[PDB]
Design a protein around this ligand. Structure first.
Ligand code: NAP
Lengths: 319, 112
């Protein structure tokens, strides 16, 4: 039962759990539950010290850590037994040399869609992506739209989420560009046609969850996440060079965490804007955020001072 | 022919060792945030380097005392001669031409 005011050292009655919640997204959600009060049980896989930069997030005795593997059907059953809502961000990019990647969107999201359903969680949640379509594409982008089919079977109440290409602070989406000091910028694939997607700013997505986290009355009913206006141009790859003015790694260095001459190059140009009829955002709102204004912050390079940026974009068309 | 073998040997250990220190963890997978937090403990510091003179003269002031102690250098080869008086009478001139050039300026060093 909620008490007092939402500042910190308060209650607000919801427990949670957030699986994953180390890399870019999960760190940035829990930080919004280390404020309005919670009990956020964040487990994590292998990382003893990479989770510390998190701890000054909940006040005291709020967030609490466990250890788990995730192919053991017990490790997901020992935590969740006491919970209210449980969201799931788990999963990643490239196929691991260990995890074969095929069912880690299939077996894992179900492996935690095991006793969670049984044990009496509620308002269980999962992630989708705006561009994943069960027609043939894309080797990584596929197996994600299987969860929308395969996993939705279990837990008839989900409110599974479908956002766009997101740009954060430390994010890897818009940062693959501008790391491209290289033989030259070569768009994908050397064509200025279908860029770009709906680049929503990471706050609005992470403010969506906690707006549905007790919504009420969204369960089973899936939503998708609007971008800003409107579609976008090729200039986005020029815009990068317009302003830029041209966990558990190792001790020394790794062996392979590449640019992946594979799905990576073709996952970024898959575009496929999709069904509007999903509610999907202002209903869960109220949030929408632009690009032109919020892309200076995340981009700071070797001038570090000059900006003087006047150049904008129409939409662009198909708009 | 073995000198250059003893020089490019030396640099190539040094010009190696930069990369195996600077570069090797430089591509490591740690965080390394781009935030403008660097340039320690004088956070911003926006100015030109102003001209500050008594910094300057201590350049010039040396450069001239420098020259003649190249002129002064071939004494110990010149101590072997025929008529030597043209040495002692002459050798001792440069020095006193050096030491004079002090005494004048010595009225004003300022804070050196
Ligand atoms: N919504 C979007 O815009 C978007 C964009 C790209 C990708 N995604 C997908 O949506 C989620 C966003 O992930 P992210 O942005 O935070 O990047 P991320 O690097 O994939 O973060 C995932 C974290 O969980 C770990 N992990 C990987 N597989 C795991 C597993 N089976 N079980 C437990 N932990 C696992 C990863 O390594 P450790 O195991 O060492 O912790 C990493 O620490 C991911 O599922 C991602 O594949 C979403």
């Amino acid at each position: 039962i909620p008490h007092g005011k939402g500042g910190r050292s308060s209650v607000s009655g919801i427990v949670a759990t957030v699986f994953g919640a180390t890399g870019f997204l999960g760190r940035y959600v829990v930080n919004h539950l280390g404020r309005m009060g919670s009990q956020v049980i964040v487990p994590h896989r292998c990382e003893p010290y990479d989770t510390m930069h998190l701890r000054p997030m909940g006040d005291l005795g709020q967030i609490i850590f466990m250890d788990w593997n995730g192919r053991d059907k017990d490790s997901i059953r020992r935590a969740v037994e006491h919970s209210s809502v449980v969201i799931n961000l788990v999963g990643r990019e490239w196929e691991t040399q260990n995890f074969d990647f095929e069912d880690v969107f299939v077996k894992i999201p179900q492996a935690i869609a095991q006793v969670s359903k049984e044990a009496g969680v509620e308002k269980f949640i999962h992630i989708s992506h705006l561009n994943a379509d069960i027609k043939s594409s894309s080797k990584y982008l596929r197996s994600k739209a299987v969860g929308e089919k395969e996993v939705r079977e279990t837990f008839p109440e989900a409110t599974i989420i479908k956002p766009a290409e997101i740009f954060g602070r430390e994010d890897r989406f818009l940062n693959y560009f501008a790391n491209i000091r290289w033989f030259g910028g070569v768009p994908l694939i050397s064509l200025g046609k279908k860029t770009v997607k709906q680049p929503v700013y990471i706050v609005d997505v992470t403010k969506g969850i906690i707006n549905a986290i007790k919504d009420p009355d969204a369960r089973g009913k899936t939503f998708a996440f609007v971008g800003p206006s409107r579609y976008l141009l090729f200039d986005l790859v020029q815009y990068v060079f317009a302003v830029a003015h041209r966990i558990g790694r190792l001790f020394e260095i790794s062996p392979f965490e590449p640019w992946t001459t594979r799905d990576k190059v073709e996952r970024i140009h898959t575009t496929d804007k999709i069904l509007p009829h999903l509610p999907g955002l202002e209903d869960l709102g109220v949030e929408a955020t632009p690009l032109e204004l919020k892309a200076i912050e995340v981009l700071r390079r070797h001038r570090t001072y000059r900006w003087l940026s006047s150049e904008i974009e129409d939409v662009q068309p198909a708009k | 022919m073995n000198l250059m073998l003893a020089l490019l040997t030396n640099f190539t250990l040094a010009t190696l060792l930069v990369i195996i220190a600077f570069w090797l963890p430089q591509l490591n997978v740690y965080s390394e945030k781009t935030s403008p937090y660097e340039c320690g403990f004088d956070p911003m510091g926006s100015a030109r380097l102003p001209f500050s003179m008594k910094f300057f003269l201590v350049a010039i002031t040396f450069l001239l005392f420098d020259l003649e102690i190249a002129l002064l250098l071939p004494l110990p080869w010149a101590s072997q001669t025929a008529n030597l008086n043209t040495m002692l009478t002459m050798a001792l001139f440069l020095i006193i031409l050096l030491a004079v050039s002090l005494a004048y300026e010595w009225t004003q060093k300022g804070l050196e």
